[PDB]
Amino acid sequence: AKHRPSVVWLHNAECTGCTEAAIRTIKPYIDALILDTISLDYQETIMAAAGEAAEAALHQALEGKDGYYLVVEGGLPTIDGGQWGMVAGHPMIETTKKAAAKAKGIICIGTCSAYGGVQKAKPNPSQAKGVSEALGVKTINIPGCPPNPINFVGAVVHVLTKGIPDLDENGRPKLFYGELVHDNCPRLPHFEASEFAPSFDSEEAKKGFCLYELGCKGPVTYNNCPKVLFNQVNWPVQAGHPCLGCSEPDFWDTMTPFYEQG
């Protein structure tokens, strides 16, 4: 019985798309990961225990002799003493702060935990913040809405087996976020030739012309989408739609309107 590193996974202000993304991993599949590689010790979406039994499981993990890594999905809503987001009668900010204090490392899965995400968009009625801001500690950020499981699982595995990966200015592993979406886009030759679709119904769009005039944020977005694809089959631009810039901090506000460059 080789001991498997303990992982505590918290859900704050989130849509669960990051959990869903993670379980699309195929190298390895999620069962192999949690049976052979990690000990996934708290995960609200799939854990058997509920209520006090679940809360007890969290505290058991947090007190584990061997320590644990923390994964955080979701931003933290801070208005009104953090009471607009609660689990087990405790503000999410309180529980996340507690879990983070003794974590071996903190991985923020998704743009929400990394940077604040959709609920932080203007006018931010819940006063949501990203984890690093809310806790005042450095986080390994795996952004995207959601990130590719290749990027999340690769980060987790890197962290448990190699150390902390080199991170960019925004906390993202350069292994996955070092290149612009645009620099790897198959439509780049059209961009270079000023061959842009003026609308989705246009013949230009049928011919696979560049989507920049239709708001594509590829040129300013760091991600590996066209290189690794999603679900082993596709990515947004391949499906004829501009990139929203979803791995960029505060993209809800910096990359909108989505169908324009203005």
Binding site: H3, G17, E44, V118, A128, F200, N234, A239, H241
Partner: protein
């Protein structure tokens, strides 16, 4: 009989795990049965507020992040809603593509719910270790189609895997499970626990395939990126090889639905036949899905292949048409400012106002949607009763198969068991329709690849987008003023099912359904979970 304690007092379950989002359930129990209940949603994000003043074209990208479990469905409802507001009729190919992506989402969503969210309420995973794999293989041959995954050797390999895991002392997601040490409310023989556990593991792999299928048309999953105002952007999705791969993957997924999902569902239903007498409600609503005409909300309601309708007081002889003007939302028992009761979504208000935990006057972030003053259950069971009542041939056939297998009357479906069964029933039906739907779009796409219609942004308009998402009747409602979002309101299946009391003090469907719940062990109240999970809760959807 059904195990039941003598317990009298309160039980709170927070967090409700194995759902999307953050739910607290409070009940009062008397002599081992629930006598009162509160469904208290514990997170607010405020997407409707965030949307104000923004580009209507942006709405679908914000609202899709209402939820990543029912990914896509909000992008779809928003896209339908803006299409309606700008008065554009999408090309036939766009209707077909949008509807197939919805079908792929049903398949993925329902498989994951049954196995990874719901099954642990009925299946004691640790008891699988007690099973003899040979006896288990024999039993499997007697409850399900022949398959190599159900052989003694395959089931032994699963058992050996589970044994090594449990013996490691690191139980992970099974830590403190309600079934540890045995539980009077868990009925399954060890052999059935082993069979279901093997399938649970298989389903973790098969869901990846269901998502791959969906992403061929959707761009990616989660969070698709192929819809635009006026139709779809994905010209490649109309082409031969992608569609052949889409078909091939969908067939694998559907083989698993038919080989594992439905058979496990039926075995669980047979062992837990008493759950046909627990957790019923009376009113059902659906906007319908899989329409042949999506030119308007009216046409969607009328031509949905999974029909729309309203059933009241379990009367299957009187399916009414949906009156979209009769929907409104109350906030009397919700964490919103005073003055917001009785609002049709076009006039919706979202003014958050928290009080305190377990304030019986204000106890949820969900609004309370009502229909002419009545609560309405939405989702697979609502769709199933409506279709059955209307004599929809596929539902009639499959419902009757299930009723004949379990030897129960259709009235037994007004229950937590029925709610669970309905989810499988409709999954089998989607599966049976995939090839026909794929061929329709393949042929249409080959003849003419029109996928997006021209449209014009009006200065001022309003519109509504309807869908029946995996969890039920979803609607998005926009008011446009100065070509910008003046109001955007989501009314979501979870809101209908799990919201709090309405302005009359009337319980929501989940609160009503919880009344009468037996509690065998107050320390480990799995029966509360059985009913709540059967509604397939999504709190991020519900509150947005």
């Amino acid at each position: 009989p059904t195990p039941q304690s003598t317990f009298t007092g309160p039980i709170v379950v927070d967090p409700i795990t194995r759902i999307e989002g953050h739910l607290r359930i409070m009940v009062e129990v008397e002599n081992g049965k629930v006598k009162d209940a509160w469904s208290s949603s514990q997170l607010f994000r405020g997407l409707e507020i965030i949307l104000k003043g923004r580009d209507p074209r942006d709405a679908q990208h914000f609202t899709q992040r209402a939820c990543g479990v029912c990914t896509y469905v909000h992008a779809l409802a928003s896209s339908r809603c803006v299409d309606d507001a700008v008065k554009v009729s999408i090309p036939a190919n766009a209707r077909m593509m949008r509807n197939l992506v919805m079908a792929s989402q049903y398949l993925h969503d329902h498989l994951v719910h049954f196995y990874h969210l719901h099954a642990l309420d009925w299946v004691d995973v640790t008891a699988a270790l007690k099973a003899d794999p040979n006896k288990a293989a024999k039993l499997a041959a007697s409850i399900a189609p022949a398959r190599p995954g159900n052989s003694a050797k395959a089931l032994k390999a699963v058992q050996d895997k589970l044994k090594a895991f449990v013996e490691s002392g690191q139980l992970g997601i099974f830590t403190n499970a309600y079934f540890l040490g045995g539980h009077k409310a868990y009925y399954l023989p060890p052999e059935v626990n082993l069979i279901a556990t093997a399938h649970y593991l298989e389903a973790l792999h098969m869901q990846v395939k269901a998502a791959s299928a969906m992403a061929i048309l959707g761009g990616k999953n989660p969070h698709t990126q192929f819809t635009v105002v006026g139709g779809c952007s994905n010209y490649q999705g109309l082409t031969k090889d992608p569609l052949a791969n889409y078909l091939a993957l969908s067939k694998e997924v559907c083989q698993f639905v038919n080989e594992c999902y439905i058979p496990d569902l039926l075995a669980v239903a047979g062992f837990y036949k008493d759950w046909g007498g627990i957790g019923g409600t009376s009113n059902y609503l659906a906007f319908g899905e899989f329409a042949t005409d999506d030119s308007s909300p009216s046409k969607h309601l009328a031509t949905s292949q999974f029909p729309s309708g309203v059933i009241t007081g379990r009367d299957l002889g009187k399916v009414d048409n949906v009156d979209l003007g009769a929907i409104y939302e109350d906030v009397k028992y919700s964490w919103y400012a005073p003055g917001g009761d009785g609002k049709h979504p076009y006039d919706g208000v979202t003014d958050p106002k928290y009080t305190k935990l377990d304030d019986k006057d204000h106890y949820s972030w969900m609004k309370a949607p009502r229909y002419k003053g009545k609560a309405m259950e939405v989702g697979p069971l609502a769709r199933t009763f409506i279709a059955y009542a209307k004599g929809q041939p596929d539902f009639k056939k499959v419902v009757d198969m299930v009723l004949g297998k379990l030897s129960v009357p259709a009235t037994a479906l007004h229950s937590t068991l029925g709610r669970t069964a309905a989810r499988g029933i409709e999954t089998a039906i989607v599966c049976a329709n995939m090839e026909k739907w794929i061929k329709e779009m393949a042929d249409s796409g080959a003849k003419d690849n029109t996928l997006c219609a021209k449209w014009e942004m009006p200065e001022e308009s309003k519109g509504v987008g309807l869908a029946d998402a995996p969890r039920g009747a979803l609607s998005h409602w926009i008011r446009i003023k100065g070509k910008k979002i003046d109001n955007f309101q989501l009314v979501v299946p979870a809101t209908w099912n799990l919201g709090p009391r309405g302005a009359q003090g009337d319980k929501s469907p989940v609160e009503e359904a919880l009344i009468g719940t037996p509690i065998a062990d107050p320390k480990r109240p799995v029966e509360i979970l059985r009913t709540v999970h059967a509604f397939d809760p999504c709190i991020a959807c519900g509150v947005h």
